[PDB]
Design a protein around this ligand. Structure first.
Ligand SMILES: Cc1cc2nc3c(=O)[nH]c(=O)nc-3n(C[C@H](O)[C@H](O)[C@H](O)COP(=O)(O)OP(=O)(O)OC[C@H]3O[C@@H](n4cnc5c(N)ncnc54)[C@H](O)[C@@H]3O)c2cc1C
Length: 472
């Protein structure tokens, strides 16, 4: 049938291929040696760690990733329960515990303000450009009605957790009016115990034999042409995919699923002729930030067996001091804390420029510095050093160049719709998490965008017979 090339074998590319293959001549071209992309589960410390996607966000009926995980046998009773579908130790950098009552009070203050960002939905000329500016103004009003330093330090950790959630260096970089367009499905977030990559491996396995080609990065997509196949008779095609290895692959349709960070760096060379201006501008304007994981293995657990998260509050910090491009005093003060892995393993999370700095450090520097942080925040100078480390390095990854999109100051939800806009004749189509207006920065948004592009192409194919139908 028609020749389709899907660029990228993350969940969006795999989802598009699955729908289309189930009769086109279809190949998926993956730059790296395996499938999954930002779903990347690795065998480490004798078990499995998630370098990328970690949770099914909102594991309920309308989440297609939850439905596939269930179909594939990748979830347990708790995760599949009706109860789950319907839905900590806090340390200060002074080495003392933070009161649960005070933490609850500040969580209510902060998350109440996050809910108020909905007041800006559909506003053309917002008073403040960013979520961070709105939050800071409201916190300043609260402070004028108020220990005060301790409250501001706890609030600073909530800002840093929000940076992880948005995948931004700062909430001051996140556009205010578009913020509430992101949709949260119900359900208590859950992991896939065998690794998130089990999901993408199963979708790949259902494709026809050898659909996905690995270590096959694409250099340039040549479109808007009339290109002859290197065979006699020379059948003509609108597109040629030029691979980094020199392969010249003709196609009728190319579905691009590469990450937004890759497009920001390479859009000028990756498409010939250039992308239309409004699409090129959407790529530039949208946000694409870094969030990384730092796994630390210990010989023995120093935490309580029941502890799930070791949250850190950095004393004397305040969100009212920080601006959109300011850095914390040291890179590790951007770390929110550590999740206990369910061997004794912790998983630290860090977003932004301090996270990109962490990637430039050696494994030894990260391990030693974090051992020192842990000795400091737990108030135990004799805490044993971590045995080993495994960290993600998403900003450094040449085919990704960050973690996930956000609607940055200067962009709107309309830019995510421009990312999805196909090129004329559906010669080039776009899927991926940064093409979904309400589920961007998730696995289910990437999956849904791949199904969207497959449905768009099937409708074109089904319409071709009508070109030959006369009126009389
Ligand atoms: C640290 C981190 C934490 C996250 N946490 C969560 C979470 O808990 N839950 C959740 O739902 N989502 C989370 N996400 C987001 C989620 O992982 C992504 O939104 C989703 O996996 C993106 O899928 P995709 O198909 O759009 O892109 P990708 O998975 O990035 O796939 C794109 C593919 O294109 C390939 N590629 C790039 N350039 C080329 C080229 N030139 N030629 C060929 N191939 C190319 C890449 O190698 C890659 O395999 C997280 C992501 C990260 C990195």
């Amino acid at each position: 049938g028609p020749r389709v090339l899907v660029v990228g074998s993350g969940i969006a590319g795999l989802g598009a291929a699955q729908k289309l293959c189930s009769a086109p001549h279809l190949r998926v071209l993956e730059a790296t040696a395996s499938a999954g992309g930002r779903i990347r589960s690795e065998r480490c410390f004798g078990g499995v760690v998630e370098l990328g996607a970690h949770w099914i966000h909102g594991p309920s009926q309308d989440n297609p990733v939850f439905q596939l995980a269930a179909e594939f046998g990748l979830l347990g009773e708790k995760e599949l329960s009706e109860e789950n579908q319907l839905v900590s130790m806090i340390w200060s950098s002074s080495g003392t515990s933070v009161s649960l009552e005070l933490m609850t009070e500040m969580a209510r203050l902060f998350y109440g303000l996050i809910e108020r960002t909905r007041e800006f939905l559909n506003e053309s000329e917002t008073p403040m450009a960013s979520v961070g500016e709105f939050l800071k103004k409201e916190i300043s009003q609260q402070v004028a009605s108020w220990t005060r330093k301790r409250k501001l330090a706890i609030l600073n950790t909530f800002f840093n957790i929000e940076c992880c959630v948005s995948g931004t260096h700062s909430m001051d970089l996140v556009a205010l009016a578009p913020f509430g367009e992101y949709t949260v499905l119900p359900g208590l977030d859950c992991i896939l115990a065998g690794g998130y990559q089990g999901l993408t491996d199963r979708i790949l396995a259902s494709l026809p034999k050898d659909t996905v080609a690995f270590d096959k990065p694409v250099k340039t997509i040549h479109w808007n042409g009339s290109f002859q196949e290197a065979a006699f008779p020379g059948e003509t095609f609108p597109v040629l995919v030029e691979c980094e290895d020199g392969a010249r692959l003709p196609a009728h349709h190319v579905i691009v699923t590469v990450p937004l960070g890759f497009l920001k760096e390479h859009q000028d060379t990756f498409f010939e002729p250039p992308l239309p201006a409004k699409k090129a501008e959407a790529i530039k304007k949208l946000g694409f930030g870094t969030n990384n994981k730092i796994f630390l293995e210990f010989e023995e657990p120093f935490w309580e067996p029941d502890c799930q998260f070791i949250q850190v509050v950095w004393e004397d910090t305040s969100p009212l001091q920080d601006t959109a491009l300011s850095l914390q005093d040291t890179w590790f003060k951007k770390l929110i804390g550590f999740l206990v892995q369910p061997s004794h393993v912790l998983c630290g999370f860090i977003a932004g420029l301090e996270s990109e700095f962490m990637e430039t450090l050696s494994d030894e520097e990260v391990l030693l510095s974090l051992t020192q942080v842990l000795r400091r925040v737990t108030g135990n100078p004799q805490l044993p050093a971590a045995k080993s480390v495994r960290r993600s390095q998403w900003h450094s990854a040449p085919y990704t160049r960050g973690s996930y999109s956000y609607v940055a100051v200067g962009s709107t939800g309309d830019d995510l719709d421009l990312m999805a806009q196909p090129l004329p004749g559906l010669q080039v189509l776009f899927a991926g998490e940064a093409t979904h207006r309400t589920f961007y920065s998730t696995t289910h948004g990437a999956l849904l965008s791949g199904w969207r592009e497959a449905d768009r192409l099937v409708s074109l194919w089904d319409s071709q017979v009508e070109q030959s139908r006369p009126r009389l």
